[PDB]
Design a binder for these strands. Structure first.
Ligand SMILES: [Mg+2]
Ligand SMILES: [Mg+2]
Ligand SMILES: [Mg+2]
Ligand SMILES: [Mg+2]
Ligand SMILES: [Mg+2]
Ligand SMILES: [Mg+2]
Ligand SMILES: [Mg+2]
Ligand SMILES: [Mg+2]
Ligand SMILES: [Mg+2]
Ligand SMILES: [Mg+2]
Ligand SMILES: [Mg+2]
Ligand SMILES: [Mg+2]
Ligand SMILES: [Mg+2]
Ligand SMILES: [Mg+2]
Ligand SMILES: [Mg+2]
Ligand SMILES: [Mg+2]
Ligand SMILES: [Mg+2]
Ligand SMILES: [Mg+2]
Ligand SMILES: [Mg+2]
Ligand SMILES: [Mg+2]
Ligand SMILES: [Mg+2]
Ligand SMILES: [Mg+2]
Ligand SMILES: [Mg+2]
Ligand SMILES: [Mg+2]
Ligand SMILES: [Mg+2]
Ligand SMILES: [Mg+2]
Ligand SMILES: [Mg+2]
Ligand SMILES: [Mg+2]
Ligand SMILES: [Mg+2]
Ligand SMILES: [Mg+2]
Ligand SMILES: [Mg+2]
Ligand SMILES: [Mg+2]
Lengths: 58, 116, 94, 136, 81
RNA sequence: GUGAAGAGGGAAACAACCCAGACCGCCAGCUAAGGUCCCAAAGUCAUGGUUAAGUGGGAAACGAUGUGGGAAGGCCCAGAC
RNA sequence: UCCUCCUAAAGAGUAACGGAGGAGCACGAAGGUUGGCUAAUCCUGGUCGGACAUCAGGAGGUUAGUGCAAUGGCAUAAGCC
RNA sequence: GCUCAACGGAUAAAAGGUACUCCGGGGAUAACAGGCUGAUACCGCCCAAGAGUUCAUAUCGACGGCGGUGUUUGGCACCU
RNA sequence: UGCCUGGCGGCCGUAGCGCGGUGGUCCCACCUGACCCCAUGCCGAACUCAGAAGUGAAACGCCGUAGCGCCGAUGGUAGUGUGGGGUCUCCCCAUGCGAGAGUAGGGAACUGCCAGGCAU
């Protein structure tokens, strides 16, 4: 119900700790990892925060 | 000037009773009249009031601004306060000296039954 | 008389204003009176030529937006700090 | 050579020189010498460009100096190791942002102000330009 | 070419002042809210002022920052909780 | 943040830079930075311009009818330069 | 060794043989409480009396004061009788 | 009752020399040289007030400005 | 319910100054007197008491007034979080936040409880 696909497209090696925690909150683990999350403003805020290294499919 | 220095002279004990939450008897003194009012601890509403400007008090008196009028006022405001169930207050001199008409008022209210 | 052609800004802010001054334009605003303020954009080389005269800053100017003439006056202008260019102009409805 | 008479403190941090300037418009006179680059102007560079335009106008017209050197600059002496306190105050500078009007001038023609400010800008490390009094 | 010194080597220890409990933050009675030198803040309802102008809670509840008075001074009060 | 304690690919080579985190094996595929004339894997790809300096492929104040584009101006078939 | 400000990057904290200043006490009242009061400076007039004593008025409104360094406070005065 | 002030105070109680020297270690740390840098130095250049009978630029060039080299005096302490 | 005044607040300058006007039945203020209660490091000035002949001069209150003070958009600019980039002492791009100053303009407060007076 209003769920979207989020796909990690870049690495998280040199990234900030807050961005690594945001990717953990989305549940992304490795590159090309496509995950399925609900569409809330909190989810959209994490995607906004790491939009450079994810790809939202909706 | 004189009004302002009286307010500066009163505004320490007024703020102290403001934070004590004290129901407070407020005296106001003129050369001709003397005023009294019992104020709630919020300071925004009154409970009872008495004066020498009222007819029921002034018509029994010689002059409205002597010690006998001030004692009649403190008696009337105490009997109205005890009618309304207000017994314990704190006396606000309102920047006057506790002396003369103010003291005779507070002694009348103590004698009529208020406790301060 | 100076007749200036303008267009209503579809978007505002810093990125838009930088991007207009990139594309040889500059924003302005018409305000005053009871009407709401109107966020316009002008051609830079035209208005930069028109402002060299003191008539520009004295007379009443006609601004055409959507074929709708608005008689204004030049209230204030923000200039580039070291280039002969215009950042932004305030127009008060006369 | 311009220099403050008194100072609240004798020395100052090195700081930075980022940002745009404030003395942008030609306030007092008719013609102006506007800074385009960024940097610091010493009191010697200011007084040399003042001499070059005072002589180029034959004391005709009036010349304003919009800047003032108020930042002390320290240097350590030669063959002194890097510790043991901050260096000694040697000279005074004025921090210059782009857009700062450095000088103003009136009472002279435009072409004379061009050749005077050109003789002055040849004494200055930063790149300048010529400006006039704009209405508004 | 050896020489120099520095008459300016001193400094004192950091006293760890500031606001210990912020707004909307439930405290116990006696909890230190603010340590400060002067009365940069002032004591409101259910808030005592210490010997060193320290603001402590006289009761339990939430901290309320508010601006009152003609001088626009900043008061700290404890809301009930 | 990386190295330290981290290999791999690129930056000619180049701990700390860019991409990216090596369980093992495969004569399988897709990609990152960076690249596609030969050394040396992949476009002598397409379309439209600029440069003539080997600029690219090292550097300033300043200087100069180099050349491309744009907006305006003042003289001018009552004859301009 | 201790205190104050800056460096210190708007919570705390944060270094250098970095920039500037102080302390190693005092007070039996300079503490407590009640009551009351409100400065600096300048102007005018005025015996000795003068730039400047004291006195009266006026502007001002804390630019003063705080036992001592600086900072933060202080009119409900924490200042003064 | 301690200027134990070297102020978390080695003891109640303590200054120096070694080119007559010695041991353990360090390129964690100096002198030589190299390296980085280029303040300084040196070599150029820009403007041109003037000097040069007149005449800024034959030769010089004040006040000031921009670079180059790595060449002096130095800075750092990366190798030993 | 209307007007006016006094007291106590709320709020803390859109509420404050200034300028002009205006008020006295009541109230308030000044006032009259002081041997007394009480008071002056002298003084009934203040504090206090006993009063009410006079006056609204001052103060205070009210009304008006934009010389200020104050408030204050819209747009833009500065800055900046993240990511990227350059000619990297400093800037640019995408995106998010977004001032200060200034401008137009606003603006000569609003409101609660009690008591009294005159009208209604
Ligand atoms: Mg941006
Ligand atoms: Mg590696
Ligand atoms: Mg390689
Ligand atoms: Mg590598
Ligand atoms: Mg390489
Ligand atoms: Mg492929
Ligand atoms: Mg690619
Ligand atoms: Mg090949
Ligand atoms: Mg801090
Ligand atoms: Mg911080
Ligand atoms: Mg004391
Ligand atoms: Mg008191
Ligand atoms: Mg005198
Ligand atoms: Mg010791
Ligand atoms: Mg120790
Ligand atoms: Mg040995
Ligand atoms: Mg070493
Ligand atoms: Mg060496
Ligand atoms: Mg060099
Ligand atoms: Mg040099
Ligand atoms: Mg000659
Ligand atoms: Mg020469
Ligand atoms: Mg030169
Ligand atoms: Mg080191
Ligand atoms: Mg070597
Ligand atoms: Mg009036
Ligand atoms: Mg009297
Ligand atoms: Mg009057
Ligand atoms: Mg804005
Ligand atoms: Mg603003
Ligand atoms: Mg006002
Ligand atoms: Mg008024």
């Amino acid at each position: 119900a209003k769920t979207i696909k989020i796909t990690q497209t870049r690495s998280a090696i040199g990234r900030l700790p807050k961005h690594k925690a945001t990717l953990l909150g989305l549940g992304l683990r490795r590159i090309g990892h496509t995950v399925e999350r609900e569409d809330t403003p909190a989810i959209r805020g994490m995607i906004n925060a790491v939009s450079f290294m994810v790809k939202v499919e909706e | 000037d004189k009004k302002s220095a009286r307010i500066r002279r009163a505004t320490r004990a007024r703020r102290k009773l403001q934070e004590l939450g004290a129901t407070r008897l407020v005296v106001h003194r003129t050369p001709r009249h003397i005023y009294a009012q019992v104020i709630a601890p919020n300071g925004s509403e009154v409970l009872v009031a008495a004066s020498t400007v009222e007819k029921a008090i002034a018509e029994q008196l010689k002059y409205t601004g002597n010690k006998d009028a001030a004692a009649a006022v403190g008696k009337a405001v105490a009997e109205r306060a005890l009618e309304k169930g207000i017994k314990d207050v704190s006396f606000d001199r309102s920047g006057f000296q506790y002396h003369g008409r103010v003291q005779a008022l507070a002694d009348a209210a103590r004698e009529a039954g208020l406790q301060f | 008389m100076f007749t200036i052609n303008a267009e209503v800004r579809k978007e505002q802010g810093k990125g838009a204003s930088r991007r207009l001054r990139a594309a040889n334009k500059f924003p302005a605003i018409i305000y005053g009176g009871k009407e709401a303020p109107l966020a316009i954009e002008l051609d830079h080389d035209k208005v930069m030529n028109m402002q060299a005269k003191a008539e520009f800053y004295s007379e009443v100017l006609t601004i055409v937006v959507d074929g709708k003439e608005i008689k204004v006056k030049a209230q204030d202008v923000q200039r580039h700090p070291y280039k002969p260019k215009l950042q932004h102009i305030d127009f008060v409805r006369a | 050579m311009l220099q403050p008479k008194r100072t609240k403190f004798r020395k100052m941090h090195k700081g930075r020189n980022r940002g745009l300037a404030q003395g942008t418009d030609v306030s007092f006179g008719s013609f102006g010498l506007k800074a385009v680059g960024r940097g610091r102007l010493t009191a010697r560079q200011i007084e040399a460009a003042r001499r070059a335009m005072t002589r180029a106008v034959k004391r005709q017209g009036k010349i304003w100096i919009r800047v003032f050197p108020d930042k002390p600059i320290t240097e350590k002496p030669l063959a002194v190791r890097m510790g043991k306190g901050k260096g000694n105050v040697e000279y005074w500078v004025a921090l210059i942002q782009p857009g700062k009007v450095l000088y103003e001038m009136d009472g002279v023609p435009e072409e004379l102000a061009r050749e005077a400010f050109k003789l002055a800008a040849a004494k200055l490390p930063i790149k300048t330009t010529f400006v006039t009094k704009t209405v508004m | 070419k050896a020489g120099g010194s520095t008459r300016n080597g001193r400094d004192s220890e950091a006293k760890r002042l500031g606001v210990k409990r912020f707004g909307g933050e439930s405290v116990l009675a006696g909890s230190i809210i603010v340590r400060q030198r002067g009365t940069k803040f002032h004591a409101g309802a259910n808030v005592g002022c210490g010997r060193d102008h320290t603001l402590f809670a006289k009761a339990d509840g939430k901290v309320k920052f508010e601006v009152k008075g003609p001088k626009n001074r900043k008061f700290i009060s404890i809301e009930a909780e």
